[PDB]
């Protein structure tokens, strides 16, 4: 037992991380088969309101230094797809895993492999916030670090890191180079929009707590979906849908606590607080675990 | 910026995990060069107050099934070292990293690669508690999962998982098979002893918060080491030593906040609480980050 925020084992992604250098700019790239994917930001400096089409036309293959550990990888083609650069290299990565490029939804989680100069440094879990930012840990040089999920040895890549917003949260793209949220890879006054709490995840985590022996917040009451959603709106929680209730079915069955029964507990927690008590070691309600994340750790 | 609980990239350890089966018992082992390390518990069932010396004498090499993915590894020798079994195999692991076996101190952190049937499932950070337990996430089949730190591509293994205590916390050994704390690998009423809060780590995390822009808890006061330790004892915090102050030097220098100045903030937080505010997203004081963990993420 126990419940911990847990990343996927990162080995399959570690074998894909390379360093990409163009001029005086270095960042990370992702080497799959004979293509390296990285942020197109690598082709400009600080002086470049940039036109990336013009900037790339003025580059040649030999302007791109790609290093996989010690071995230099010869660039033989270059192109741009939205905000990512694709560098064709003369060697297929022999450690390419089975993989997919997937775009994830707000409220879903993924593992981030933080990398610097093509060298992985740490791994942690992130949720895509409703406002399309993530609360990561990225220092200078982390551009091109990727986010992923792993399912039966298939790596589903969903995130490439591009920048940090003024509040210290983080924005990036899918692996097709399309930004999550209303952000751009140039210097503007862009800021994170208003955020909300992911209700279905909070309920999943309350189920995790019950499975792990925390029961003090339970009560004999049930509530209707409509009356719960009135309370949710008051506290800046997302509305709960019938599909959310359906998704929580397996956890509800395992614990014998109907979803709308648990909603009555969440309503009381929102209105009264915790009164000095904690849930799974937290004094706040946690919304960064999906129902899948809980079921993954609460099989027993 | 940002501050996240972050595990080391797990790839080097993933390449060492195997499955060890003896009879109807299966668990995880660690394959380094031509030796597999696993909990000696693998040689008994439920009926075995066991004498492990007798149990091992009654075994042969062919009683041990070791599987590295698909490939079966032939066992050619077996011996016991304290609570770990060493199985000599006829193949050196070609993916053996540079490694060391180190025993860690209470208050230090490490990454856990949770594994089932020789297959890694997730990675997370743990601190060794003052009472020599860890607050992990381990389901049935996780025995033999290992904890480690990585320094310049050298893996320092420090933990092998053995069992779960009645409070849901976890106990295990170093890789020499010596238990952390007053625990044994048989069925007793053993329980975790009283625990305390790791003061130096809480201060390191307050420094992390300042580096990341949380300043509301600061004040103009300083305190003496002796007067702080009077408050620490009252709230079940470990005493702060001069070596702790010395260790926090680099963080104190980066922020310009003397250690004893930060101690005055911690005293006020202990006596008054947070008054509805949070620090790095927590409503509780966090003690599972070492000064090293902070410096690792707060270079900027």
Swiss-Prot record, chains A, B:
Domain Peptidase C30, first and last residues per copy: 1-300
Effect recorded for residue 143 to A: Complete loss of 3C-like proteinase nsp5 cleavage
UniProt-annotated catalytic positions: 41, 143
Residue spans, topological domain Cytoplasmic: 1-300
Cross-linked sites for Glycyl lysine isopeptide (Lys-Gly) (interchain with G-Cter in ubiquitin): 5, 88
Catalytic activity: TSAVLQ-|-SGFRK-NH2 and SGVTFQ-|-GKFKK the two peptides corresponding to the two self-cleavage sites of the SARS 3C-like proteinase are the two most reactive peptide substrates. The enzyme exhibits a strong preference for substrates containing Gln at P1 position and Leu at P2 position
Subunit details: 3CL-PRO exists as monomer and homodimer. Only the homodimer shows catalytic activity. Interacts with host FBXO22; this interaction promotes the proteasomal degradation of nsp5.
Protein name (database record): 3C-like proteinase nsp5
Residues of the whole record sequence present: 3264 to 3565 of 7096
């Amino acid at each position: 037992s126990g419940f911990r925020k847990m990343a996927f084992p990162s080995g399959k992604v570690e074998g894909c991380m390379v360093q990409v250098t163009c001029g005086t700019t270095t960042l990370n790239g992702l080497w799959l088969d004979d293509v390296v994917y990285c942020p197109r930001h690598v082709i400009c400096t600080s002086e470049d309101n940039p036109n990336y089409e013009d900037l790339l036309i003025r580059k040649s293959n030999h302007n791109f230094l790609v290093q996989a550990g010690n071995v230099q990888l010869r660039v033989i083609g270059h192109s741009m797809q939205n905000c990512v650069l694709k560098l064709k290299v003369d060697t297929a990565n022999p450690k390419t895993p089975k993989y997919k490029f997937v775009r994830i939804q707000p409220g879903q989680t993924f593992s981030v492999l933080a990398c610097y100069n093509g060298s992985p440094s740490g791994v942690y879990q992130c949720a895509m916030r409703p406002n399309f930012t993530i609360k990561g840990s990225f220092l200078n040089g982390s551009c091109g670090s990727v986010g992923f999920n792993i399912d039966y040895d298939c790596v589903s890549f969903c995130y490439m890191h591009h920048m940090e917003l003024p509040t210290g949260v983080h924005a990036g793209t899918d692996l097709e180079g399309n930004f999550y949220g209303p952000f751009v890879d140039r210097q503007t006054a862009q800021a994170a929009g208003t955020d909300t709490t992911i209700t279905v995840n909070v309920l999943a985590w309350l189920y995790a707590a019950v499975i792990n022996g925390d029961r003090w917040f339970l009560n004999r009451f049930t509530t209707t979906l409509n009356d719960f959603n009135l309370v949710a709106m008051k506290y800046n929680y997302e509305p709960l849908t019938q599909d959310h209730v359906d998704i929580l079915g397996p956890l509800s069955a395992q614990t014998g606590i109907a979803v709308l029964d648990m909603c009555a507990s969440l309503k009381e927690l929102l209105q009264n607080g915790m009164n000095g008590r904690t849930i799974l070691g937290s004094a706040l309600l946690e919304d960064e675990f999906t129902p899948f994340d809980v079921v993954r750790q609460c099989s027993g």
